[PDB]
Design a protein around this ligand. Structure first.
Ligand SMILES: CCCCCCCCCCCCCCCCCC(=O)OC[C@H](COP(=O)([O-])OCC(O)COP(=O)([O-])OC[C@@H](COC(=O)CCCCCCCCCCCCCCCCC)OC(=O)CCCCCCCCCCCCCCCCC)OC(=O)CCCCCCCCCCCCCCCCC
Ligand SMILES: CCCCCCCCCCCCCCCCCC(=O)OC[C@H](COP(=O)([O-])OCC(O)COP(=O)([O-])OC[C@@H](COC(=O)CCCCCCCCCCCCCCCCC)OC(=O)CCCCCCCCCCCCCCCCC)OC(=O)CCCCCCCCCCCCCCCCC
Ligand SMILES: CCCCCCCCCCCCCCCCC[C@@H](O)O[C@H](CO[C@H](O)CCCCCCCCCCCCCCC)COP(=O)(O)OCC[N+](C)(C)C
Ligand SMILES: CCCCCCCC/C=C\CCCCCCCC(=O)OC[C@H](COP(=O)(O)OCCN)OC(=O)CCCCCCC/C=C\CCCCCCCC
Ligand SMILES: CCCCCCCC/C=C\CCCCCCCC(=O)OC[C@H](COP(=O)(O)OCCN)OC(=O)CCCCCCC/C=C\CCCCCCCC
Ligand SMILES: CCCCCCCC/C=C\CCCCCCCC(=O)OC[C@H](COP(=O)(O)OCCN)OC(=O)CCCCCCC/C=C\CCCCCCCC
Ligand code: HEC
Ligand code: HEM
Ligand code: HEM
Ligand code: HEM
Ligand code: HEM
Ligand code: FES
Lengths: 51, 79, 62, 164, 378, 241, 378, 55
């Protein structure tokens, strides 16, 4: 399990963070778009499907 | 298996492609096809139309004829 | 010639798949509301008068 | 590449929106039906019963002990000291009209429903655990520490009571 | 190291849907079988959401169907999708049979026969599901069609008694059909998987008919997007036929509650069976009508033996292709004759249509195939 | 062996493929149902639900539902009594049993309203047709004393007495009640009852066409995009000898 | 030109049972899995005819189950077989899981994971079939276990509402559990076939824990006979279990029709849930007993990872064995508690049971194997 | 619609009351149990149900 540890692995995760973090943001906002989540839709000036 | 790695013998036949991005999707897509469509058309309408027209004719044939055996009856049954 | 706004727009969101998915998400979020309400107001507009929402007035707020 | 990727992206968006549509449809189906929808939050029978009696109007299928309690039973609420309660709750906060009250038949444990018009406190008696209840149905004896649930409700029209 | 070739399951999918070699020159007709594969799952989930309300009781069912059409949240869409969508299933299925017969993909014998058994299975599921909705056509239709087996000199009349579970149509018989109707589709899935499994290990047919082993081409880059487009356009056909033509596809009369008492004017069987039912009009003796009925589907098996023309297909042979179109036209004949209320001219037309429907393939096709062979040293 | 008369198609407002039923004639046809249409027949599949969104606010839907009251069931004893009229309640029970209608109608039960449009060939236009089809018999044709001859009935002689007549029912709307316009209100209302989701369905259907139109060219463009490599390609054959 | 080997149609079976090598040393325990397979097939054929007559709403329910119980021909026969076929199917099952945890056959990777998936799927299957009879047990049991999904602070209560099809425990909801129970096992047989598909090339296992790579045996002559004999024993114990004492292991002691006010003294299912159900009783507040409710079963995936022995078969690690059989004692203890309604002395036995579980699996055994890694000087 | 006949052999044994609330009146709020399965409806057994009436 200790193998995960390593000098490149620190740099490597450092490198991969933007791509996977971006996915989380994309996945999160998209998931909000899919469940049509409430309270954030309060915060959008345009997409208020509510009257 | 029968996958590409081992199949039929084939030799000094050669391919010339292009990257999709380098070429536009619709190279004269209109003008080239219409004569083709129409030629395929004149090719097989000769072998497709007659069953369907014969069918339509028999359709109105039996419908109208039996209808004449149908609506017209009281005169056919006489007084 | 000089790159089109679309051209630099490639170098932006398209080339990176995460950002690509992102613009797909925001694009869905806008296409949803805008097209949805477009179909709203238009459907309301075509066969006008068949709608009872405009005929609510016979019986609303006295 | 920006051009054709623009194509693929736009296709992806229209398809994703369409997907949210049809999946929303398929989830919407299971979620409810119009008949149970009409069943919902509708039971307009205030004062169906004489005061002091405990009526059991059905709601969400589950019977619901509505009651036009006598004022003397609000006095029954007043008499027992508030801190004697494991869950100090004077009745007036628990009901809009003090003469009125509603109770779920469910208890926190098995869910078993105590009998109406049977209780040493002048209210309920609970056979499943020996818990005893006054007119409020207020929690007294355990194991359950909390009150039987009293879901919010409004007497929309004055005699047309609507739980929910 | 290799990921698709890593996991053995992935090895299987990569031997197939990821990258099985395929002919390149394929047209839409081959897209249609994939369209069947599209329809199947859709009917399954749709029927699942329907199975969340429908009852198999003689009494309580219809009220639950009304629970569907009016109570359920957008479930009416589901109702019509399961119905009309099944209709679409048969649509594509017929084109598909036409293709396999036309481009001679029946040359893959075992694959072909599994296709046949799959066909009978689909027919049965069709009939019984059609019995389910529980209405006038449901009742009298199921009764009448069931009666056919009584044509058997001994066993069959007994057998109807066995299906019904009683003297007549009833919660017995209805729940019976609900269960058979449910169990078969899942069988159809496994037969499909087995079917493709026969297909992979012989290679796919090509529009040319002549082998394209030299021209085999990767599946994923190309045909996946092709079939996606094809499914999306069928989705157009279906959604336009449901949101704009909600009812026309079927036979109103089921809309009336069933009465063993009250009896419908005409009891036209639902349209995909019409040619089959037309053949019930074909000849005297109900027994032989049942025989020819089963033979109408059974006869397909003869063809690979009956085939003898050098083509593995039928596109470079307009000659025999003409006999083909005469046969298709003949199917149109049996169709529309089956649609009409029974009449004498319809009777004679149905007779000769049936005789010719067998004889084009028992007489014309093989022998003209022989003379066609004589013309060019075949 | 005798033919049923074949009702000609008529150009109703909703038959337009984009066209929707208006809530108007459905409302007035509902006023046609509120009184004269209790001869029964039936509408029991449909309660006063559905009526809310089409024309009637909740309290007004209930107000509409107290107009008549079906029996409450027995409770703890206390069997059989009449609940005032929530919309959750159904339309009035036509008869304690249909057989009573058969006694009331020479044994021929009057059919439920709910499917009569959907079930009959020729449909709603046919229902509007038979209402107005009461032609006199020609000489020499027999009729039962209760029967009131009308070609649109398949047996040519419907048992029903023409419920419609000139000025059947003055509307609360106050709009004039010619047998024609009131019958059009009838079958429009029926088509409503026949397909409650219809007006809503068209909106969904129209919306889908736009979606399909956008999708149909784009995805096709991607097919051209991925098959262009194969369509373009040139091949050559150069023998070694 | 072997009809078996050469012919593709059956080749997978030659890859399978006909001629897969298997270790020379195999006890009855490895035969148990095949026993479980046969039991599954029997559950299908039995549940099927049950559905052939069973049907329900709120109204049809127990009257129809009794329709089986008397009115249906041999209906009591089938329903008694099925009800006792369940817990017997588990007799094959938890024993197969137990031996699986023992000999370290979970050195095989994905077979273990998917096996666990089959475990949950069967869990929900039995629970969602259990409401079919619609006895008061079915009602309040389904009510409680459905209430367990309220543990989620947000979505879970609604998901309860959403499985319900509405607000209450209704005919719609029973219809849900009906069709779900009525389809889900087919997913089970699919995943099971996939589970064997993981097993294929990996080979089997031996009691010894040393690979019998040199000593594998053809399956058909031997292990098949052993399978059939096992089938006779399982069928024997089942038929004895039911034809003589149908209500022995079977405990549906609420033939009382379900009522909203009615509530049986014990709101508990059969034993196969109860030892898990008891876990809820131990820790106060449902939430932690929910995390336990899943993870206590879900932790089996962690077992291959935390494995620390250098050797397959625990037969050679006596201390971990003792702890293991003690785990057997802890779980049977959870069952016996599961028959016991919530009480103080059983509260203490409750948390003691939980902690006993935790320490027995999660920590102790690997440390033991470390200690003999010292004793064997690995 | 309502009338009386001997009722053929096929029929079920007669309902004590037209409606259950009548049984919730005759005993007041406590309708008697169905008997056909009531033995099999209780924990214990035939000895239990007999015990229930034994004393
Ligand atoms: C709904 C029922 C299901 C059946 C519909 C199939 C679904 C549509 C589809 O397959 O995509 C289009 C699909 C795309 O072309 P493709 O996939 O390359 O065709 C390959 C065929 O294997 C090669 O055969 P083909 O496509 O060349 O068909 C031969 C056809 C030649 O017709 C065509 O090739 C296409 C003509 C259809 C469009 C008509 C003009 C545009 C409007 O000639 C005839 O059979 C009779 C000629 C008279 C028809 C008039 C055609 C032009 C006017 O075209 C078709 O094959 C469908 C049949 C179209 C002809 C029907 C004529 C009816 C009269
Ligand atoms: C909305 C925009 C969406 C674009 C799609 C239009 C129609 C799609 C279609 O049905 O064709 C099949 C089309 C694939 O065939 P294709 O690639 O277009 O034709 C083969 C090659 O392009 C090679 O075929 P080609 O060399 O014969 O190409 C000629 C013709 C395609 O040749 C044809 O056979 C005619 C097909 C187009 C007319 C059919 C009705 C259009 C609606 O395409 C053209 O260049 C003509 C474009 C303008 C059409 C009308 C011109 C009037 C002025 O789309 C699919 O992938 C579906 C496959 C399975 C069909 C099942 C769908 C229902 C079930
Ligand atoms: C769903 C839950 C079920 C629970 C219980 C499951 C029980 C499973 C039971 C089935 C397993 C198989 C039973 C074991 C039988 C032992 C083998 C026996 O049959 O002998 C075989 C013989 O089998 C036959 O030969 C097979 C071919 C002949 C089949 C003809 C069928 C005849 C009767 C069928 C009647 C059907 C009538 C249908 C009318 C429509 C050969 O195998 P073997 O042990 O090595 O014997 C060696 C001795 N030799 C030399 C004679 C061969
Ligand atoms: C009732 C209504 C139900 C609707 C079902 C629809 C089924 C009717 C199909 C009729 C479609 C008519 C359009 C035909 C188009 C056409 O002619 O294509 C020409 C083309 C020639 O192409 P090539 O051979 O490549 O020649 C190239 C020359 N350079 O011919 C073909 O496409 C033939 C291949 C298509 C086969 C599909 C036939 C569809 C008919 C299905 C019914 C027959 C099946 C019978 C089985 C029944 C068993 C129970
Ligand atoms: C992955 C790829 C996608 C697979 C899933 C299905 C593919 C989608 C294809 C749909 C074709 C285009 C039709 C779209 C029309 C449309 O949606 O119009 C909107 C309207 C709803 O919105 P409105 O009421 O009009 O107003 C906004 C309300 N919020 O929706 C419709 O009327 C269209 C009805 C068509 C339904 C087709 C759905 C079929 C897809 C099947 C997927 C089922 C999976 C779900 C099962 C879950 C179980 C694990
Ligand atoms: C839930 C349980 C509810 C059931 C109620 C009552 C059940 C009582 C279970 C007690 C049965 C135990 C008796 C087993 C007898 C026995 O094992 O003999 C010793 C014998 C000696 O084996 P060797 O090491 O090979 O000897 C070498 C000599 N050549 O040990 C064994 O072989 C047993 C190993 C197989 C394990 C089978 C045990 C069955 C119970 C296991 C279940 C526990 C896991 C629970 C996880 C469930 C999670 C969903
Ligand atoms: C004469 C009593 C009576 C009147 C008044 C009446 N109904 Fe009818 N209606 C019947 C009966 C009985 C039939 C069918 C008689 C028959 O088919 O022989 C019928 C037939 C019909 C039919 C066509 C049925 C068919 O088979 O073609 C329609 C449409 C119809 N009525 C509309 C209505 C409606 C809606 C009402 C309001 C309830 C109404 N008429 C008033 C009892 C009546
Ligand atoms: C819905 C169930 C079915 C499935 C999933 C299935 C598989 C379909 C599909 C997917 C194809 C392969 C070609 C393609 O779609 O790209 C075709 C395989 C095949 N099926 Fe079936 N089939 C089904 C029912 C039938 C029936 C009823 C017949 C008629 C006998 C049949 C005859 C064939 C043939 C001949 C092939 C080989 C493909 C080829 O050579 O072009 N299929 N069908
Ligand atoms: C392709 C094979 C199938 C066919 C031909 C078939 C028949 C289809 C069709 C034709 C409808 C009838 C709707 C109507 O007539 O109004 C529906 C009958 C029915 N099927 Fe299936 N079915 C099939 C697979 C399934 C599956 C997999 C399920 C469940 C998951 C299912 C659940 C139903 C129900 C509930 C009905 C009756 C619906 C009604 O009353 O309108 N079907 N399906
Ligand atoms: C229908 C359900 C199942 C089938 C058909 C299946 C396959 C069964 C059977 C047939 C074996 C094969 C080994 C032998 O024949 O001796 C065993 C494979 C295996 N299963 Fe499952 N299994 C099933 C459910 C489970 C469950 C719930 C678990 C535990 C989570 C599990 C753990 C294993 C293991 C470890 C093996 C490989 C055994 C070896 O090394 O020989 N199985 N079980
Ligand atoms: C191994 C999986 C299955 C188990 C353990 C099982 C037993 C389940 C559950 C747990 C019960 C109620 C309690 C009981 O009698 O055991 C229900 C019994 C029943 N099952 Fe199954 N079943 C299973 C698969 C099926 C399938 C696939 C069907 C439909 C084809 C089905 C139809 C029924 C019916 C109608 C009952 C109640 C009748 C009775 O036996 O008393 N079951 N289901
Ligand atoms: S059972 Fe919860 S308080 Fe008595």
């Amino acid at each position: 399990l200790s193998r995960f540890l390593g000098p490149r692995y620190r740099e490597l995760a450092r490198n991969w963070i933007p791509t996977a973090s971006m996915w989380g943001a994309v996945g999160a906002v998209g998931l909000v778009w899919a469940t049509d989540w409430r309270l954030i839709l309060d915060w959008v000036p345009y997409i208020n499907g509510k009257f | 298996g029968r996958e590409f790695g081992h199949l039929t013998r084939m030799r000094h036949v050669i391919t010339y492609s292009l990257s999709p991005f380098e070429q536009r999707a619709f190279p004269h897509y209109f003008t080239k096809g219409i004569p083709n469509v129409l030629r395929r058309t004149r090719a097989c309408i000769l072998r497709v139309a007659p069953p369907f027209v014969v069918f339509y004719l028999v359709y109105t044939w039996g419908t109208q004829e039996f209808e004449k055996s149908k609506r017209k009856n009281p005169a056919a049954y006489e007084n | 010639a000089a790159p089109t706004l679309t051209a630099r727009l490639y170098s932006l969101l398209f080339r990176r798949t995460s950002t690509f998915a992102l613009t797909i998400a925001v694009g869905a979020l806008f296409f949803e509301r805008a097209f949805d309400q477009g179909a709203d107001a238009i459907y309301e507009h075509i066969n006008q008068g068949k709608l009872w929402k405009h005929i609510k007035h016979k019986y609303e707020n006295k | 590449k920006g051009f054709s990727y623009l194509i693929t992206a736009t296709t992806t968006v229209g398809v994703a929106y369409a997907a949210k549509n049809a999946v929303s449809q398929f989830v919407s189906s299971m979620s409810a039906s119009a008949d149970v929808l009409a069943m919902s939050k509708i039971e307009i029978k205030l004062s169906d019963i004489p005061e002091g009696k405990n009526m059991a109007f059905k709601w969400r299928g589950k019977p619901l002990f509505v009651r036009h309690r006598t004022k003397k039973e609000i006095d029954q609420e007043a008499a027992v000291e508030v801190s004697q309660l494991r869950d100090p709750q004077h009745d007036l906060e628990r009901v809009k009209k003090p003469e009125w009250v509603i109770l779920i038949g469910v208890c926190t444990h098995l869910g078993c429903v105590p009998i109406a018009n049977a209780g040493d406190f002048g209210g309920y008696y609970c056979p499943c655990h020996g818990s005893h209840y006054d007119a409020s149905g207020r929690i007294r004896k355990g194991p359950a520490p909390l009150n039987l649930e009293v879901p919010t409700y409004e007497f929309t029209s004055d005699d047309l009571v609507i739980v929910g | 190291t290799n990921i698709r070739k890593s996991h053995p399951l992935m090895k299987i999918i990569n031997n197939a849907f990821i990258d099985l070699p395929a002919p390149s020159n394929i047209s839409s007709w081959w897209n249609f079988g994939s369209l069947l594969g599209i329809c199947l799952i859709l009917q399954i989930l749709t029927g699942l959401f329907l199975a969340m309300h429908y009852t198999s009781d003689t009494t309580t069912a219809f009220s639950s169907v009304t629970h569907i059409c009016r109570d359920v949240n957008y479930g009416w869409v589901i109702r019509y999708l399961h119905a009309n969508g099944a209709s679409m299933f048969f649509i594509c299925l017929f084109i598909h049979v036409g293709r396999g017969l036309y481009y001679g993909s029946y040359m893959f014998l075992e694959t072909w026969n599994i296709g046949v058994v799959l066909l009978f299975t689909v027919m049965a599921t069709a009939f019984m599901g059609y019995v389910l909705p529980w209405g006038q056509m449901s009742f009298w239709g199921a009764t009448v069609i069931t009666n056919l087996l009584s044509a058997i000199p001994y066993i069959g009349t007994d057998l109807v008694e066995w299906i019904w579970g009683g003297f007549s149509v009833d919660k017995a018989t209805l729940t019976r059909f609900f269960a058979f109707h449910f169990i078969l589709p899942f069988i159809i899935t496994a037969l499909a998987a087995v079917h493709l499994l026969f297909l992979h290990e012989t290679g796919s047919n090509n529009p040319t008919g002549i082998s394209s082993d030299m021209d085999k081409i990767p599946f994923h880059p190309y045909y996946t997007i092709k079939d996606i487009l094809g499914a999306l356009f069928m989705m157009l056909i279906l959604l336009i036929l449901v949101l704009f033509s909600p009812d026309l596809l079927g036979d109103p009369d089921n809309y009336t509650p069933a009465n063993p008492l009250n009896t419908p004017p005409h009891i036209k069987p639902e349209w995909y069976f019409l040619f089959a039912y037309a053949i019930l009009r074909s000849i005297p003796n109900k027994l032989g009508g049942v025989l020819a009925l089963v033979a109408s589907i059974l006869i397909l098996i003869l063809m690979p033996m009956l085939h003898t023309s050098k083509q593995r297909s039928m596109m470079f042979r307009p000659l025999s292709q003409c006999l083909f179109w005469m046969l298709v036209a003949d199917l149109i004949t049996l169709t529309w004759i089956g649609g009409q209320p029974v009449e004498h001219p319809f009777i004679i037309i149905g007779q000769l249509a049936s005789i010719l429907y067998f004889l084009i393939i028992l007489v014309l096709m093989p022998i003209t195939s022989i003379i066609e062979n004589n013309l060019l040293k075949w | 062996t005798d033919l049923e008369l074949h009702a000609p198609s008529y150009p109703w407002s909703h038959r337009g493929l984009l066209s929707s039923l208006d809530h108007t004639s459905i409302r007035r046809g509902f006023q046609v149902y509120k009184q004269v249409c209790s001869s029964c027949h039936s509408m029991d599949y449909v309660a006063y639900r559905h009526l809310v969104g089409v024309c009637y606010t909740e309290e007004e839907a209930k107000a509409l539902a107290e107009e008549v009251e079906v029996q409450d069931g027995p409770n703890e004893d206390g069997e059989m009594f009449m609940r005032p009229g929530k919309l959750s309640d159904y339309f009035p029970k036509p008869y304690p049993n249909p057989e009573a209608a058969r006694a009331a109608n020479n044994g021929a039960l009057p059919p439920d309203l709910s499917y009569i449009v959907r079930a009959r060939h020729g449909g709603e236009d046919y229902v509007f047709s038979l209402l107005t089809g009461y032609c006199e018999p020609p000489t020499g044709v027999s009729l039962r004393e209760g029967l009131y001859f009308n070609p649109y009935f398949p047996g040519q002689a419907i048992a029903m007495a023409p419920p419609i007549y000139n000025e059947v029912l003055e509307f609360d709307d106050g709009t004039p009640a010619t047998m024609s316009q009131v019958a059009k209100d009838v079958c429009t209302f029926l088509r409503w009852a026949s397909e409650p989701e219809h007006d809503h369905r068209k909106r969904m259907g129209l919306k889908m066409l736009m979606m399909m139109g956008l999708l149909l060219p784009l995805v096709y463009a991607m097919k051209r995009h991925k098959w262009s490599v194969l369509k373009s390609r040139k091949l050559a054959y150069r023998p070694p000898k």
